[model samples]
Target: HQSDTHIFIIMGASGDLAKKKIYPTIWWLFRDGLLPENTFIVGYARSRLTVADIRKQSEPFFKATPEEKLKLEDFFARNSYVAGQYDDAASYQRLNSHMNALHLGSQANRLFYLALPPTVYEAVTKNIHESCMSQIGWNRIIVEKPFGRDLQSSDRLSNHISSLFREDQIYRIDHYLGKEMVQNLMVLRFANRIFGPIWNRDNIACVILTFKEPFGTEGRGGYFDEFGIIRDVMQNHLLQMLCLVAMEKPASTNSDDVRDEKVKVLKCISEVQANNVVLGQYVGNPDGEGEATKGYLDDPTVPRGSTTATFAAVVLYVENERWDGVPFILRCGKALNERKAEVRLQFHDVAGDIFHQQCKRNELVIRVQPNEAVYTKMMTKKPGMFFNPEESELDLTLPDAYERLILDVFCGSQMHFVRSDELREAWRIFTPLLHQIELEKPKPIPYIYGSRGPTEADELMKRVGFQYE
Candidate 1:
């Protein structure tokens, strides 16, 4: 019933993102029978390339087996390529001509994936609307993150895009929401009887969302240096996770209902202050891994004496009744000792327990990357005759993140996607603190590459009521 002929136009197909993520994602969906029968893919970029060239560039990322080689070829047959400039109306008209040749009637839909940088968003968007938008069928566009540098810029970009297309026609993707564990957060909290009753400040001590990258930008620091850690990870990824963990249950599972609740939670959060934050930049590798390791400023692409933060920790509080007085800690860093993304909820310690005076608090951890897992840490008595209580865990790891998320896109599910208002409010909450950081021009404490972060990070965590064992 939902079947409809459609064309997906990848705007920056020659770029790394298209080759590494967009093409592979499309292949996965097609292979799993998720895409519609008449769906076709078109790769558009400034670089001239043949269909075979596009296929050859993207094939390495497909992970197809020898037995599936024929299937892979069939998949590539449905893909075509078009070279065009972002701002040129004539180029878009040429692209439209190709679309018309593929689908002559009013039944064909259009979905544009803008895999290009943010700098070209406006020009490409205007070009699409003027020359390529389908006059008869639906037109949808997917925009990637770093929506804008800050609140003012984000507002401007949102206004311009909204003027061109209706809200439903635009999909601003935050891939974290697409992750398997993140999608499971709603069911885990609202569906389970045990968690719903104790999800508030009464039982919970603190909530922490952590993201760590094992390696730095390497030589790819040009783009990263401009935004730093806050814009890179905390603003979009960690904030989305926070909304899932903190928002009140939605009226229904509809996309609007879920996003509305997330907005409310964000609005309740007071502005973050300078005192509630910690910032750091990585120096030389302290572990002596080899000469290949370099500090943040050592990179040829980075500016000398740059103050951009590679590690950031911030504490925020939601003023609503359910989560009032509870501290939400967000920490993220590049070139850390490990690669992980997880949400940890620490519950209050048992009161008046006769067995032990310092019993560890119950903790629920939802790991989002490296290996997906959900586990609860609880104190239990020793298995043998000994009365000593020790910490034990109950673990449940889910399937891959991308597999679940990609399928949801074809299913027309927006429950895991960030809404426009949600993005605005998240920026509203952090913009003031960001301005303060820039105004003061405070030097970020230096931590060694491949280490956790600055030494003061532990002190800051304890000050915010997080007990690290």
Candidate 2:
């Protein structure tokens, strides 16, 4: 167990993210005896709140039982709250004073979690550096995503953060990277001898990374409109999955080694083309009974006649030796038939067919969300006496994604976190297409609220040799 005492300062303590995700995650860690023995949590925000108020706001998310509630009371005892301005150095000095009074000495480690908006990042970071940075112990910072709108902006933000902290001290949190199946991708590919030789252009025809959500924005379209599906899902989540699926084996399990290989694969990808892209927006459900489902435009928060796409599909090719001819199809959308994120690798067709009929191509699937699983689809002999081949799957469903990821973070594993250059290169691959879509303002094809995306998506998939089951 870790014995060092540390103070965790949450920058936006009063926000929804802190109550919903950060606090709950921290509580789970503490409950499971994963946190250090003497660690203390401090909530820093503009709103003045007492420890009791913080506990009240965060308790609903915990859903603790009577016995668990007592444990939570103990957990809250280790937590305190501070109200301060994001940009003012005086506020950070006051925060420092609180830390000093909490038995944190000059050698106590500090971790600052920036749960605030991007606009306040620079101000908060500057103030922390000036007034709250530890004189002796290590200091680290965790920042949330939507790092920037595009490549240029991302670079600028990344550069500014790098100036304040060393690359090792900055953790760019991409929650998808924290998921169980995503972390398992490396072990599945590299540890298994069967996958090593065939995980390339020779045996694989194409790979598809997909994300689907069953529900619409539900009055949250204002935020969804700003980034659309690509920036919100495809750019960070699906693209990160693609890297794990296609990246070469790292020399060792070291974090930088793994990140370097991921960057190499990303750099091998060519720019996305408009001809291979499909965009769509959802209309009201045509098949629902009584009152029909509302569409994207029906949301009062969304701007009228907004061109933001609720669904997007694009094809990209990695121009390296192992994956030269293979097309990586990346797709994501909201208000689809179901919610899932998965990677599907369709292999080449059976070469010698003696059964006088075409055989189904083999496929390896990695399901990242909704249910975490890895399965392979191949032909199997029927149970009957007759010589018949049937499609069957070899399946393995893993445990919860966040449970594994959160533990990994506490253990100081950087293998699952995204590196800076990886983020930059990912943006490099998609920025041009994003620019074109914004410039042309192409009218997205309409699809029903609870169905698959536009018909053009199917055609695009068919054109790229992705056979649907």
Candidate 3:
């Protein structure tokens, strides 16, 4: 497979996703020579738009280098826009004609990027099937998450999409898998020989995956409240990272091979027990821009008595031969102290302590966002006459997570993308917990905004054997 003609028909191209993510992803991919040849981008939405309008919106996000400016004109020429209806077959017919016109012959690979909300997914996809499937090359649809509200809804949507297209044709995008640090997990753990002996419950006590955001849902409060922190991030983003961090080494690095191993890990894990979960919502704090940072309920859009959690810490276990009793603590939150994501593998306590003092626990930490780096802390003797054991440090994307993922879509690689079973198992693990929250209406423990979630979540982290650094 050298190269093929591809048309990335973005379903909602005039929206913020196109402005901030999809377009910038394509632009950078094109800029860096990562795209397949004869690739075209088509922005389709229900508004009067042009290629120039798409370019104008994406300019602020992708700061091109001087060399890139030279190629920007050609890049813009390769992209076009189609103003169309969400469900109208006529609009998709026009889209079909546009895609056909840009192809080399009567054949071209078509990728329907569903950047729009899930509300229009059913209609938009049906219309695509009715009018815009490629007859010559392959066709794949890139679906972003919030796969559905819960397991049942997600499966309903899933079954419908599966009927329209084959399983291989569906591309479920989880940007965390495309992250540079996350992508390195396989090589760091499998490609190297050292981790093979120690990447298990015998040596590892806990696998903690943490994602924190410093800002609140400033404007998306209404939509965010409906999903809360669990649906918004933990279920997909943090869980996917945990899959990579704990999944067994596969037979090969092939897409299905890797995904199969990931599913096995998810299956071994039972649903989260409510007793092992900690949910929290941030309250107003007096130290931000303007009049104090608004609490979760302070937003006008949130319901007056909403118990939606802005933060959550839940301990999960992968009960298998390799990771039978190890805790996988997945914690994520918004309106916290700082913006960061990390995976920490806390090693078991040292045995037969010859030292006079307690030894620090060994931790191999992979920082996912911000200053991306991987370091491990091992117990060592300090540089003194006293032979006291101390911890020492060992340290290790030019491309954005979206860029790697988008480029993979162009290349027809699903290694970093989530499969259907993977999505189903992920939802299964959290659906019971989510439904419990929805029906039981448990009030989230309140903590001040701009701090590290609630003390309750902290206690959960501690109880689950997480060794924070």
Candidate 4:
């Protein structure tokens, strides 16, 4: 477990990222008695929210009901807010003074969480190094996603962050990793003898990893228009999930051991060829007045005539020995037909059926969102005068992800968050494919809002002998 007296300093504390995510996460940590005894939080931003405002914003994140005897007043008291422009070094000095005053012990670990927009990341890091970080105990930097726009920018960002802090000191927070099923992938694979041997190309027909959101940006499609679904979701979140699923077993449980294996799998993903990838954008539906509704272009932030895609699906081939012939298909989108996030490992059909002439293919569907559970299809004896094997899920119920992951983080387990090199390797694998799609494309396939997606998405699946159904 991590030392209890660690100090957490949150930048961009007034932004949506802070009030919506960071602060809430911290509140849960404190309320559950998972945090260190002497822990204190310093929220820094340009806004004028007092400590009370921070606590008020975080109220919803508390899982305990009023009857649970949960008290947050004292926890909120330990939190201090400092408002200032990010570029101001003097403001950073002020933050340093707060830390110094609070640093009762000789070594006070500092965790700097950047909840602001990406534009200010570099400047904040530079100021932190010059004003506070260079003379610290163990210091950690936790950053949110959208690591970069593309390959060059990703590399630049990674290198820039690496320059200021050691690689291990940086933790790239990908919330999907915090998912229960994703974290359980290894245990589910390695612990079971029946599944591990068959988890390769020989037995597996194809793997479908999907994440779909029912809601769109509403009015925030402008940002979505610039990066599209691929960059925003696929490049980092989906691809990382693929890596974890397809990666080989690591030598040890250490961060380096696990991350090295993950990087190896990511390196094997060559550039996705044409027809292997598909993109789609949504067009809003019109009302009864026969007028155009708010389409992707209709969003005030999204520039008119923009071609940014709201949906993306790709068929990737891992050239490694274990996954050589296996197809790893990733499908993700917003404003789709359903709200779901899952990883489905579909197995091939039975060879030379003995009991019956026809039997459905086996599959292991692991749901990662809306609920956390595993549903598997396996052959079982039929209940009748005529005995026959059938397919059904052996285990249907799994525990919630957030509850366990937050516990793990509090215990200092490195199992959930992505290491620095893992982030670099993930970006490295898809950078070329992303560049190809951006620089050279006829046009992104368009789909009406609230639809499944472009019909072409099915075509891409057909190429590998698969379908959406």
Candidate 5:
């Protein structure tokens, strides 16, 4: 047997968050052999349901039945169920008893995942520590985001949690770090010597990062109105992606060294001015699409005539010499024209080229979603006696993110995982801009729900010589 028997105990097992994302991810990890053979998963919450009810919630992610499905029922046979208030010492004592019974021959290692709201995190963690549920082998806490509403509150939450566990023992997950294309960025830049040396402004003109979601909030506009798109998407996810792209190559590929460099790059981002950013809210269209859509303020939770932004854009400047004056434009929103996520690195015009007038500018686009692929945007010769240039792409797509990350977790590779300090530092950089957008008085720039975002977003690009295409 290994040194420890890993036990994944989910704290909010009955909640929608657990059912939708966490459980499915874990089930697949088990079926794919990413999790160790002797490992056990315990679902703990206040749900007054039997083991069968919990299984039903997790069943949707698993398509195969007992006869036709790929996942065997026995795969989850060891999964125990515990029900009660997680903040009570008696509850953890009961959980510990359940774990001991499952830890027959091996040392028990605990991974306490909090998939619940941030409001209840401190109490639950304090109870876990006070009851000594983590005195066994290695113990970790996986926390989801919206880490806090603002910087001070975030720091307060971090400080409170720190009293119970060391920083290294916490895994604050930002799923973007687990994405295939996001992980491939490091491999593309560092693993290949061909691109590493020219990754800076000398060869690259600017970088464009975009995250688009086609569906609107539907009926959750009240919640979406409070967060808008800035903190909801750009501050954490997009800024973190920008760090991966602009970071200096680490001395080695070790997780600490690599994440250190990423944090350093993120620190170099300049403080964004109010004018340098664009905020927008999507309006309903009368003639474009036949369907009628509700605006942001229409939601019950939202204030009447609120100016919350549903779309935001910013062109970032990294103060370091390598990327100084180079623009890294981050664009993101919900209910956009199309669903797409990509990073485009546009090169400067081919100066004094032999085919200067005929050859077009070059670009390297890395598609992060809708599909995972990388292609070079270059001009090719036309099929004629006289040379004519035509734009074309060379497509190279890789495996899905789940395949890579599931494997990494098994292999104990932190290369694709985010570290605790990395998460805090990233938030540190964007918190000011986040505050500016949240507190600004003027109404958000207007754009229709089914169309492109604010004209200001496009204008921001024009100043930096970029087009939405």
Candidate 6:
């Protein structure tokens, strides 16, 4: 009697993103009883598909145990599909009527997920604002990225969105910010006394944020070529992590407080310079290990002589009190030696070379995928009665980042969402480099698909004060 009847609306019901992510996420939440009791999930697309169609496509993503199989039935019991066009107000009005029918409680709360591309975001959000908003309880919207091609376009998109919904009601979801270790970064930085003094440029030599994929674009060359790896991965995900690694402690853990610090730290970093970046395109590794594969240009979807960067390493400086003179190196690519995402803080060598034998530099590494672990590599006395220093690590391993993020949506938390200013600052850092890549159409270095991205990228890292060890 006290709660609202929440309608979980998905705007891109016919898309793969729904089948692969949104549906499965909701299914697990329903099974686990995380969703509010009166919640009903409604899917909207332009097709004339029925609830059965939605269930059938999303079924492949779920495997229920005997006890859970029954719950799956109950899970889909509240789901219904609606045919709608993003720009058509009538379509959204119909959706509103459908939701009104499901409202059993006093309050009718609505949460809409725009799982479609950015091109349709304005239309879809405008229609929702006009026709589908909750008049009773609360209204919230979830948006996915690539937010826009560059700063001007991004701001225009953002301004259009701002005209409709107030800032807090809009959630700009970045799945990387939702990640476990990324969320843990704050606690590791502010909560621990051990890291407080050593976190700055005085003790830290360079910080590396890396993302890797072991395969080429395959058939996804069109999208890959348009934006390149910088826009796809580095600008948003890696940059967000850099904010956390470098930003000061917020006034509190409140969403705005944490995000305010993110924006402030982001503002200190100037745009990426052309000279500080290394770019690469992956070629086939026919003689290499594992299965054979083709190169990026071979994909008919990709244009020949496409100057797109499948891999990029850019070094940036915060230029703030806390991180001045420290290099924040970001590296990301498709078709590398392995699939991994990580943050590595390479600390400076000890002031005094006390150890007679050569000593290794200290490094605190946080791996975000492929067996998540946070380990600090340090030098210690060799085991078994030896004064010689040896390398040692304090290791720790660990979710669907999506699961936690979606839960935040239901629970009304914007902790993981990217704010408007954060987005602008993020775009500001990369817009210059993105413009140069297109304006100059510079050729990216060719690297073997099965190996790490361009060796020159490694050389770039070493030249910028990053220790090999």
User: In model 2, which regions exceed 4 Å deviation?
Assistant: 286-292, 397-400
318-350, model 6: which lDDT tens digit per residue?
A: 888978878888888888888788888888887
Q: What is the lDDT of residue 377 in candidate 3?
A: 78
lDDT of 1 by residue, 217-314 (tens): 87777878778788878887788888888987677878888889989999999888788888999877655566326787888999877788988888
Candidate 4 TM-score, C-alpha based:
0.89
Candidate 4 ranges beyond 4 A from true positions: 53-70, 103-106, 134-136, 285-296, 396-412, 440-442, 448-450, 467-469
Which of candidates 2 and 4 reaches a greater lDDT?
2
Local distance difference test, each candidate: 0.80, 0.79, 0.79, 0.72, 0.71, 0.80
Candidates' TM-scores? 0.93, 0.93, 0.93, 0.89, 0.88, 0.94
Candidate 4: lDDT over CA atoms? 0.72
Q: Write the per-residue lDDT of candidate 4 for residues 1-469, one digit (tens) a residue.
A: 3454677777878777677766767776677656677787888888778877776777776655666533667668788888778899887777777777874632666777777777788888788767777354667677777777777787888788888877756766666554566767767877788788888888888877788776677656656766777767786678767877787766675656777787788777776655577878776786512222566666788777776777788888888898896788888888777767777787777778776664667778787777667888676777888677777677755223544554554445565566656667666666667777678753677787667778877776677756333
How high is the lDDT of residue 266 in model 4?
A: 74
Question: Which ranges in model 1 have alpha carbons more than 4 Å from their true place?
Answer: 103-106, 176-178, 286-292, 397-399
| Per-residue error (Å), model 2, residue 413 | 1.9
Clashing pairs in 4: 380-390, 382-388
Compute the lDDT of residue 460 as modeled in candidate 3. 77
Q: Could you tell me the lDDT of residue 181 within candidate 5?
A: 77
> What is every candidate's alpha-carbon RMSD to the true fold?
2.3, 2.3, 2.3, 3.4, 3.1, 2.3
Candidate 5 residues lying further than 4 Å off, grouped into runs, are 1-4, 57-61, 69-72, 104-106, 176-178, 284-306, 353-356, 398-412, 416-420, 467-469
Q: For model 5, how does the per-residue alpha-carbon lDDT over 81-189 read when each residue is reduced to its tens digit?
A: 7878767778778877777776552256676778766668878878777764555466766766666666777777877777778766666555654467776776787
**What does candidate 6 score in Cα RMSD to the true structure?**
2.3
Model 3: colliding residue pairs: none
